[PDB]
Design a protein around this nucleic acid. Structure first.
Ligand SMILES: [Mg+2]
Ligand SMILES: [Mg+2]
Ligand SMILES: [Mg+2]
Ligand SMILES: [Mg+2]
Ligand SMILES: [Mg+2]
Ligand SMILES: [Mg+2]
Ligand SMILES: [Mg+2]
Ligand SMILES: [Mg+2]
Ligand SMILES: [Mg+2]
Ligand SMILES: [Mg+2]
Ligand SMILES: [Mg+2]
Ligand SMILES: [Mg+2]
Ligand SMILES: [Mg+2]
Ligand SMILES: [Mg+2]
Ligand SMILES: [Mg+2]
Ligand SMILES: [Mg+2]
Ligand SMILES: [Mg+2]
Ligand SMILES: [Mg+2]
Ligand SMILES: [Mg+2]
Ligand SMILES: [Mg+2]
Ligand SMILES: [Mg+2]
Ligand SMILES: [Mg+2]
Ligand SMILES: [Mg+2]
Ligand SMILES: [Mg+2]
Ligand SMILES: [Mg+2]
Ligand SMILES: [Mg+2]
Ligand SMILES: [Mg+2]
Ligand SMILES: [Mg+2]
Ligand SMILES: [Mg+2]
Ligand SMILES: [Mg+2]
Ligand SMILES: [Mg+2]
Ligand SMILES: [Mg+2]
Ligand SMILES: [Mg+2]
Ligand SMILES: [Mg+2]
Ligand SMILES: [Mg+2]
Ligand SMILES: [Mg+2]
Ligand SMILES: [Mg+2]
Ligand SMILES: [Mg+2]
Ligand code: NA
Ligand code: NA
Length: 152
RNA sequence: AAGUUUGAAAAGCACUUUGGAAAGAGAGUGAAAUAGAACCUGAAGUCGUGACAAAGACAAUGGAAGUACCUCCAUUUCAAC
RNA sequence: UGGAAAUGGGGUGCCCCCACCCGUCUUGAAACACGGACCAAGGAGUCAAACAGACGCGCAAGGGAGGAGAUAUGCCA
RNA sequence: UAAGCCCAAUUAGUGAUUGCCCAUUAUUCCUUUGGUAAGGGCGGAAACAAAGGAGAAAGUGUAGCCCUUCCGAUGUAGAUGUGGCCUGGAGGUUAGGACGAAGCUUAUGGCGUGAGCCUAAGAUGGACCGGCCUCUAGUGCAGAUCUUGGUUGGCGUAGCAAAGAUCUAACGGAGAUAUACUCAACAUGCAACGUUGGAUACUGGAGCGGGGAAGGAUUUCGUGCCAACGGCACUCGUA
RNA sequence: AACGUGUCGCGAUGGAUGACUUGGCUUCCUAUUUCGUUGAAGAACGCAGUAAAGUGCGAUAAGUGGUAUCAAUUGCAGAACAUUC
RNA sequence: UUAAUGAGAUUCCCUCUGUCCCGAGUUACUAUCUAGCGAAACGACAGUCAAGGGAACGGACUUGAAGGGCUAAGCGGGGA
RNA sequence: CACUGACAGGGAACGUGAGCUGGGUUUAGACCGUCGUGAGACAGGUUGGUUUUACCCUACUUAGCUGGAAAUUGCGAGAA
């Protein structure tokens, strides 16, 4: 078993995924979730504008004590950020899904994202040095991402 | 500390395509890939996603008796019965 | 004789009423007394010897070995 | 003109006797369980094919041999009983399994006061194992500042602030000038890297100069490479 | 509205359980059974076509000689008395 | 008892001043916002008050008074 | 000792140490007196002697977003 959900019509759908991405899971969770119901072209425009810092990514769940901004009002929030490392990773994933649709013989201008899921992957371990001769964990948290889109 | 315990047999994924690569989407081997490499089974705890139920502020949990809605459950009945 | 009715179970919400946090020492705990983030696996009246009582079994003015030997026996501690 | 205090009533000089509300108490009915428990039955009366039915054990304890009757029932420390429940192995006996064993999952119901037992489904698994009578033991977990492994809120938070510092163009590189429509360009690909040439600074001869001992032992050099490591980054490196 | 709560289907992280066992522990028996200056036990360094560890071996170095057997060893090279060189 | 000496203990005087009357203004690095990276302590469950009684100082109990939800920067009354 | 209208008395864990300070009291060094054979003692004197942590909940101070009268539902209807 691969994907937690199944497209309505398989012959008019494209899929993509990536494992052990080495981006912060909490940052990638917010970046991927905002495009869940959007058309493919509209999702790609949003990521370009986030890199230009004219629009932001809303942080809805993992947002404890982050800054407030005026660009979060269009999402009905007050807190948002511009995580560039997560954005460029999601840009590559959309290109792969677009390539799969063209190979099948579909129109990328008529595709709508219908499924986005981000999960925690296995962690990697480093160490840090504290006062009074203590050693304490210094961990990294990568993530898995999967998605598919369907033609309207 | 640590069973290299995949599979009967490596037959360990030729080839197309997107990517700098890692990899993804197809195709194929095999009874099984939900057996893809330290790979039999794969629990608890924790997390993501979809559908649904609602819900002020009485921390939450709990008892007793009803009601609204649901029920991949059980049993009974279907003709001067 | 059906995508049937009915009666019991099961699930979630709601209403009226009821309802102090577990384990422990202590005369007295809910306590401003101590141990208490979650789960899996592990974790504590045992073996031997002397004595006594209750109960079961064999024999009885007798009861019973132990060590050892002998041959079925050269499969059989 | 009490909903206060002291007396006194029960529908009021009309006719005689109990105004009303609330218990794990009292009376009564149903069911369970145990007795210093109390009784009865247990020689199969006779007769009876489908197309009135079953049962009837001489019995401590059961799915209690059956029926009738009476009484008691809470409890820390503690004692005892249970044809009382559950786990690993042994002697017997009786079954199951590739038409799918063990294990695992549950808005799968049924049974039992309960410990628990059994069935259903798996769109799970792939080779062993259940019941009954005896025997045996390293035989049942919620907590011991318990042991070992894993996870987790705090949390994208505290912070990554001594030693003054970099700027520019051109090469290199996948690391860019990366767009669906509209459209001239900005308002839709950001940030970051090595080398060379310029510019600007620092060390300031008790030097981030050039050589040795102790200690280290290939860290030296060239080419390549960027999975992990250099707590930011790398096309670079004592990797 | 959002955050948050609850139940169900699916998926992650994690490595428990079951089945398996060339290992351990314990109890018995047999005998022409007990090392070294004729240099032992232990320590070091080396040896393969390819060879880091481990195993075996010692410049005759993953081994020479003899007896028995009877066609392999194998990741890839290489070699090729069968009457048994 | 003692000249010289003392990061030794003590009292007064001159000079001096933000020690104070009584505070005000400026600078570098922080805190604060962003990109990358990323912990610990602690953690029964939780978290609005007044009086009452109670192991004689309650977040939970009795009777009253408050209380729409979610958040950013600070603070040091309580969490005996 | 002065000024003034006057220089009243008390509580708040003998209010207030993750607010400060550390002079006193009360470790380890050392001197004196008295006591003890002695090691040592003295609510007797003297000198020198580390003051740790907030990023959690609440309270308080400011600073933002946002539903809602059956206080999220009923279609359950009330106009100062
Ligand atoms: Mg902060
Ligand atoms: Mg440090
Ligand atoms: Mg399998
Ligand atoms: Mg597996
Ligand atoms: Mg799980
Ligand atoms: Mg209670
Ligand atoms: Mg006491
Ligand atoms: Mg108690
Ligand atoms: Mg108290
Ligand atoms: Mg104690
Ligand atoms: Mg005799
Ligand atoms: Mg009775
Ligand atoms: Mg009793
Ligand atoms: Mg055992
Ligand atoms: Mg459940
Ligand atoms: Mg035990
Ligand atoms: Mg356990
Ligand atoms: Mg920060
Ligand atoms: Mg900084
Ligand atoms: Mg600092
Ligand atoms: Mg500096
Ligand atoms: Mg650029
Ligand atoms: Mg330059
Ligand atoms: Mg020098
Ligand atoms: Mg780094
Ligand atoms: Mg020689
Ligand atoms: Mg109070
Ligand atoms: Mg009120
Ligand atoms: Mg705050
Ligand atoms: Mg405080
Ligand atoms: Mg007082
Ligand atoms: Mg203090
Ligand atoms: Mg204080
Ligand atoms: Mg002092
Ligand atoms: Mg003396
Ligand atoms: Mg002093
Ligand atoms: Mg309404
Ligand atoms: Mg209305
Ligand atoms: Na000089
Ligand atoms: Na408390």
């Amino acid at each position: 078993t691969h994907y937690s959900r199944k497209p309505q019509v398989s012959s008019k759908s494209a899929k993509a995924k990536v494992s052990d991405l080495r981006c912060h899971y909490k940052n990638t969770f917010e970046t991927a979730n905002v495009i869940n119901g959007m058309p493919l072209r509209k999702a790609q425009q949003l990521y370009r504008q986030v890199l230009a810092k004219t629009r932001c990514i809303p942080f809805k769940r993992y947002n404890g004590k982050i800054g407030r901004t005026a660009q979060a009002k269009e999402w009905g929030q007050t807190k948002g950020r511009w995580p560039r490392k997560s954005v460029v990773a999601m840009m590559s994933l959309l290109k792969n899904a677009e390539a799969n649709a063209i190979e099948k013989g579909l129109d990328p201008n008529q595709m709508v994202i219908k499924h986005v899921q981000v999960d925690q992957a296995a962690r990697m371990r480093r160490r840090t040095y504290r006062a009074h001769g203590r050693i304490t964990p210094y961990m990294c948290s990568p993530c898995h991402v999967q998605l598919f889109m369907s033609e309207k």
